[model samples]
Structures are given as structure tokens and as C-alpha cells.
Target chain A: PLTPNDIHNKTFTKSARGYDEDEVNEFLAQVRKDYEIVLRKKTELEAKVNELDE
Target chain B: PLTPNDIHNKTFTKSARGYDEDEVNEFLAQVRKDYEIVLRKKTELEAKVNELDER
Candidate 1:
């Protein structure tokens, strides 16, 4: 699982006509946020399952 | 990302007072499918970014 900061810090190869830095950063920010949601859901589901076992 | 079928076929421990098996399976199936969507979107985004770099 990548931390938001991990995705935030990733660097790609640059070219004279490379990706728009701002756009890429924005997309990555969204991805990182979405990943956080997934992780939280995973944790919540696991906890639910565990609670059922008790 | 987990394959939907993989999650579909997975089994967990069972208990008399355990989680509802059907509910868990349904949820996992959704999770697997949702994860696939995420992965597919990631791929698309990467390709789009790559194409931008080429332009």
C-alpha cells in the first residue's frame, strides 16, 4: 500500500514536451485519496469480520 | 488488484457464530471487482500521461 506522500513524491522521466506537471500531480492526488478510501474500507471490513468471530 | 474470480473462490474460517458467509462473499466479490476498476483506471491514466509526454 502506497502512502499518499509516496505517490506524491514519485518522479517520472521528463522530456521537452513531457506531461503537464500540474495535471499529473492533481491526478496522483486523486489516486492517493482514492487509495486511502480503499484502505479504510479494507480495514473496516476486516474488523467487521473479526468482530463476527468473537 | 485481485481477480474477481479469485475472490469468488476464496474461503475463510467458519464458526457457528461467524460472519454471514454469503454477505462476506458478496462483499469480497464487490471489492475484487472494484479493485479491478481502480487498476484499469490507473493503467488508462498512465497511458494517457505517457501519450502526453510523446506529444
Candidate 2:
């Protein structure tokens, strides 16, 4: 599983004529934000489960 | 937050002069898999919390 930082810090090799940098960057940014939120939610849920169990 | 389905279903417009589709697709696939796992974990935790609360 990739962490949010992994997505945020990911870099791809550029082709002589590769995907548009701006478009790729924008999409990556969106993915990073979304991934971060998902991770946070997962963490919170895990905490709740523990709290309830205790 | 983007769902695993959203990431899996996502399509990027190709550029005659743009990023490598292979690279982008590969990365997207990885993201989708990871996101799916994260979502599953969250769902399981939520269920556990509910079950524990019911006790």
C-alpha cells in the first residue's frame, strides 16, 4: 500500500513526447489529497474500534 | 475523497505531446489497489466498532 507521501513524492520518467506535465501534476495532486483523506479516515476508524473494544 | 472505483475508472486525455500513457496507467493501477485496501480496512474497522458498541 502506498502512503500519501509516496504519492506526493512520486516521479515518473519523462518521454521525449510524454504526457502533459501539468495534467499529470494536477491529477497527482488530486490523488494525493484524496489518499491522505482516506488514510486519515482509516486511522480514525481504527481508533474508534479500539476505543469501543476497550 | 476519490473512491477505488473512481480511480479505476479515471481516464486522462492523451496529449500528442504528453505524458506516457503506460506510466500514468501503471501508477493509476497502483493507486487503485492501494486505495481499495485502505477503504476495506476502514470498513472493517467501522464494523468492529459497531459490534463492540453493541456489546
Candidate 3:
């Protein structure tokens, strides 16, 4: 499964007519940050729910 | 100026040795969700900061 790290580290194949690399990287940076945040929050909430269930 | 929706909706040109489509879609889904959450929290936090500044 592709993780947030994979998305952060990924490089796309260069094309003659292609999207801006810097812009794409900038976008990816935010995406990666968000992905990590979501994952962290999911874990935290799950644990909290489990704790309350006890 | 691509956004999370652009990432979610993008389709690559298929290749014989290309990455799996389903796998990419699945990954993009997570990315979209994450991006949305981050954006929501950012707006909320920014508003909070503004409110504190106004006080």
C-alpha cells in the first residue's frame, strides 16, 4: 500500500509538455502533510474510542 | 494550480509497465481526504487566531 511517505518521495516521469515540477512538488508537500495529519488523528481517535469502551 | 480534487480526478496515460490504476486511485482517495481535513483545520485555526488578535 502506498503510504504518505511514498507520495512525498514520488517523482513523476518528465514529459516535454508537462506540468510545472515546482508547483507539483509544492502541492505534494501539502498533500503529504495532510495525509500524515489525518493518519495521526485517526489513530488518536481510535485509541480514545477504545479507551472509552473499556 | 492543481488542487486535491485534481489529484483525485486525474487519470494517467496507461502503459504496459505503468503503476496499478486501482492502487493509484486508492492512494489518491487518502490524499484527498487528508487534504480536506488539513484545509478545514487550517481555516478553523486561522479564524481562531484572528479572533484572539481581535480581542
Per-model TM-score of chain B:
0.62, 0.84, 0.72
lDDT tens readout by residue for model 2, A1-54: 788888878788766567777877888899899888878988987776568647
Clash count, predicted structure 3: 0
Q: Write the per-residue lDDT of candidate 1 for residues B2-28, one digit (tens) a residue.
A: 344554565543433434444444444
Worst 10 residues of 2 chain A by lDDT: A45-54
lDDT of 1 at B27: 41
**Residue B33 of candidate 2: its Cα lDDT?**
90
Error of 3 at B6 (Å): 6.6
Give the alpha-carbon lDDT of every model: 0.53, 0.81, 0.62
- Per-residue CA lDDT of model 1 for A3-40, tens digit only, reads 54665566554444434556445544655566556556
**Which residue window of length 10 is worst by lDDT in model 3 chain A?**
A12-21
Over 4 Å off in model 2, which ranges?
Answer: B51-55
lDDT of 2 by residue, B1-55 (tens): 6788888787766566776778888988999898888888888877876786798
Candidate 1, position B12, lDDT = 44
DockQ values per model: 0.02, 0.60, 0.09
Candidate 3 lDDT by residue in tens digits, A9-28: 87555544345456556666
